[PDB]
Design a protein around this ligand. Structure first.
Ligand SMILES: C[n+]1cn([C@@H]2O[C@H](COP(=O)(O)OP(=O)(O)O)[C@@H](O)[C@H]2O)c2nc(N)[nH]c(=O)c21
Ligand SMILES: C[n+]1cn([C@@H]2O[C@H](COP(=O)(O)OP(=O)(O)O)[C@@H](O)[C@H]2O)c2nc(N)[nH]c(=O)c21
Ligand SMILES: Nc1ncnc2c1ncn2[C@@H]1O[C@H](CSCC[C@H](N)C(=O)O)[C@@H](O)[C@H]1O
Ligand SMILES: Nc1ncnc2c1ncn2[C@@H]1O[C@H](CSCC[C@H](N)C(=O)O)[C@@H](O)[C@H]1O
Lengths: 291, 291
């Protein structure tokens, strides 16, 4: 067995302290080990992101604009969680694809069947006015050409919507498929437990203070780094069994999930962080029909 | 006579401490009082900007890419000034219009007859590589539609060229001609002595540290402010005769010019700032054929 003792898991890209040469044969290995793993991946990251905003007092009263939301099964869990905590939020889920019917019939959630373009962003901005907007983006076109176009749309979402915070899908183009350098918004590169086995995807979390918008350039050298750091994390780290983690499941992803879940607010009072997390995890797995 | 005593002049937009309601009849008033006033306006601002970079030690060894440079008569003065000071710089002047022949025959200056587009910016970036670039932009299309397009090109100049510093033309669209909010690079809003009598134009000066790029949103309310602050400056301030300014010419613009010129480096040693400035001014006016 692949055992180890860890203090904490890597929460952000910058914390990864090692790298490995990407082995293309990794692409043929089992990408997922749990049913509905993708909904689980998104649920944890967005619960993490949103709980942070709650902590900073910027969630209550906001309209969450989620673009690239369908099917959005896991989003029903997020909505219930904050709704039950007393936080007042409106959800606007937009995708050209159809949403899970469990999202219908909630006055606080508006489903829109539309593929957004810059012009539409303008109309909804005029229509949301004057609410404070929190943007979540998971749009998907993939070539490096596709990625750049998605990233370009994500930056236009921020400039038109002008949100108070944002969570954006972020996967650096592969160095061997580099086209040109580009800019992404400045934010924390939140790592994702339960991401596919060798995925290099993370989420970019940002909070917008003032009327400024800070971007950061991404080059091929950065692309080389992303590949090696993420490859090291996926191949080595995520395959570890953290034996000094007293929890029903000690695999790295559960250890990593534990640290995100420990930041979530509940109505129920618990005697230990371990009890709250076990509760939230049980709750999350039951909702998603994960054994 | 319109007399007053002033400590210093307003160097940046933010310093303007008063405003006036824009009177449209001002548009019919004499816009210029000196021959070649436009070359003088550009010369002082760019001498100011470039001397600053020298002070920060980022000028020597740079390639100055000036887009919207023709005719560029005043640019010959700038080139000579730094060339004579021993600073090593290469100039690349690009405009679809033709440059003043006084700029020909200098190995350190390359004239390009081209209207730049994003693609061309890419090729020159590949060709300038690996020199450090200082961008100066004075491109001109004007409707608010024209402005936005120019500003959009200016931001693409920065993202493709990725300069160490930049000076950009900046005039906020008039509130009564507002189209949409937009972003401009963050920088100092340098005010311009000898600008047309009622011009609301200034120059945006920026220095790029790290791999980040900070932008700032401009709204109609900002547009209302620009109009009133600039109107107050043009109508009231610039019409002042600073009587406690011991200088051959006490009009506000000369007082303002004095503060920019006092920051310029010379080979000749002077006993007082007043002597250096008088020298630089005499020199500048003689070069431009201004009496
Ligand atoms: C993690 N990774 C994956 N691939 C390629 O990406 C293809 C699709 O797998 P993926 O990258 O997991 O898809 P996604 O990121 O769109 O969700 C695989 O078949 C590999 O060829 C990769 N190709 C390169 N060059 N470098 C990498 O780090 C890398
Ligand atoms: C300074 N100013 C000028 N204009 C208009 O701008 C026209 C051209 O004059 P300009 O603004 O000096 O041109 P420029 O900025 O392109 O160099 C004038 O005929 C006026 O109608 C202005 N119009 C408005 N609404 N507000 C202003 O502050 C203002
Ligand atoms: N312009 C656009 N506007 C809206 N959705 C977009 C888009 N372009 C692509 N997408 C959507 O991006 C999605 C990527 S998959 C998203 C999964 C979803 N976030 C979840 O919670 O289940 C697809 O449903 C796709 O239709
Ligand atoms: N795409 C582009 N590339 C180059 N020059 C441009 C441009 N679009 C407009 N311009 C130029 O912008 C200039 C504005 S007037 C500039 C005056 C000049 N800076 C001076 O020193 O004399 C015009 O010469 C015009 O041809």
């Amino acid at each position: 067995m692949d055992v180890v003792s860890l203090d904490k898991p890597f929460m952000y890209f910058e914390e990864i302290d090692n790298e490995l040469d990407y082995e293309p044969e990794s692409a043929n290995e089992v990408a997922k080990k749990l049913p509905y793993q993708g909904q689980l991946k998104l649920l944890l990251g967005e619960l993490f992101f949103l709980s942070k905003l709650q902590r900073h007092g910027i969630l209550d009263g906001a309209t969450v604009v989620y673009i690239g939301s369908a099917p959005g099964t896991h989003i029903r869990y997020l909505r219930d969680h904050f709704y039950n905590l007393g936080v007042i939020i409106k959800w606007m889920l937009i995708d050209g694809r159809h949403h899970d019917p469990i999202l219908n019939g909630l006055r606080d959630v508006t489903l829109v069947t539309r593929f957004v373009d810059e012009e539409y962003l303008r109309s909804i901005k005029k229509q949301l006015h004057p609410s404070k907007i929190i943007l979540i983006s998971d749009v998907r076109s993939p070539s490096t050409a596709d990625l750049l176009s998605n990233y370009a749309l994500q930056n236009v979402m921020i400039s038109i919507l002008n949100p108070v915070a944002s969570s954006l899908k972020w996967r650096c183009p592969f160095p061997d498929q580099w086209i040109k350098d580009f800019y992404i918004p400045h934010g924390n590169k939140m790592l994702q437990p339960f991401a596919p086995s060798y995925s290099a995807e993370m989420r970019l979390l940002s909070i917008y203070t003032g009327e400024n918008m800070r971007l950061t350039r991404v080059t091929k050298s950065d692309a080389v780094n992303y590949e090696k750091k993420m490859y090291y994390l996926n191949k080595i780290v995520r395959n570890k069994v953290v034996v000094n983690f007293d929890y029903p499941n000690q695999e790295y992803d559960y250890f990593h999930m534990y640290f995100m879940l420990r930041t979530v607010y509940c109505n129920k009072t618990f005697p230990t962080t371990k009890a709250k997390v076990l509760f939230l995890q049980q709750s999350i797995f039951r909702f998603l029909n994960i054994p």
